[PDB]
Ligand binder design. Structure first.
Ligand SMILES: Cc1cc2nc3c(=O)[nH]c(=O)nc-3n(C[C@H](O)[C@H](O)[C@H](O)COP(=O)(O)OP(=O)(O)OC[C@H]3O[C@@H](n4cnc5c(N)ncnc54)[C@H](O)[C@@H]3O)c2cc1C
Ligand SMILES: Cc1cc2nc3c(=O)[nH]c(=O)nc-3n(C[C@H](O)[C@H](O)[C@H](O)COP(=O)(O)OP(=O)(O)OC[C@H]3O[C@@H](n4cnc5c(N)ncnc54)[C@H](O)[C@@H]3O)c2cc1C
Lengths: 103, 103
């Protein structure tokens, strides 16, 4: 509903300091289409594994199969930025809260 | 085309050190609809007034008349953050480039 699990499908550089993060939300077999729950421009709050630290990211696109695309600028000494540089890997499961369209 | 002039129509401090920024891209009276050119989830590069400093921001939602909404986290001592925190005001006109959906 507002708490989701998602699996990292891609975590790649697309410039010197931007990463494309692709996540696949996980749902029960036979559930409603994932694309019904998420729209481009809405954001989710992603928790860094092993922490209670969350950051908001905008969904650049939502694929037919529900895959969520993010473009994330890496900052020096940033919590989520460090996670993407040192820990994030394809197959890792992360907790997402949302989606939301306002703060 | 790809360079736009936009008026700040809202610049509000909302929850969690986030600013809700609403921009109106400026066009001639009677022009092609802005909202066909800008889509949620795409991003634009906004320049800080009086500088050559630009940052990318994701469009959360787009009005039929082309008003663009962004939710921007204020970082301690960031360039655009510092601008939003203390300098930005309703009625200012800013340069933005885009939209884009890829790197
Ligand atoms: C609705 C929404 C959507 C967003 N969408 C996107 C998106 O699509 N893409 C994207 O890249 N970002 C997006 N953001 C921004 C994002 O949430 C994070 O702010 C960004 O990724 C940085 O997080 P971080 O954990 O890497 O860095 P943080 O841990 O927050 O650190 C940020 C910087 O602060 C510095 N810092 C820490 N403490 C101090 C201090 N006391 N003084 C000075 N500097 C300090 C750190 O060294 C670091 O450089 C969005 C934000 C919101 C609110
Ligand atoms: C495609 C895309 C979409 C995005 N969408 C959003 C969005 O919707 N909302 C959003 O909030 N952000 C978004 N971002 C992130 C945004 O572009 C900016 O990165 C963010 O707003 C910070 O910019 P700034 O000018 O405030 O800070 P900057 O001037 O870039 O500085 C950031 C931080 O770096 C720290 N710093 C500088 N040098 C050092 C050092 N040597 N060591 C440690 N720390 C240091 C500063 O203290 C500061 O905290 C997006 C990024 C991309 C690429």
């Amino acid at each position: 509903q507002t708490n989701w699990l998602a699996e990292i499908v891609e975590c790649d550089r697309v410039s010197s300091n931007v990463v494309r993060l692709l996540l696949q939300p996980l749902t029960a077999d036979g559930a409603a289409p994932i694309s019904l729950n998420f729209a481009p421009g809405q954001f989710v709050d992603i928790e860094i594994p092993g922490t209670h630290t969350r950051r908001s990211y905008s969904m650049a696109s939502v694929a037919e199969d529900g895959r969520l695309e993010f473009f994330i600028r890496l900052l020096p000494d940033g919590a989520f930025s460090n996670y993407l540089r040192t820990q994030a890997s394809v197959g890792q499961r992360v907790a997402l809260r949302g989606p939301a369209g306002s703060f």
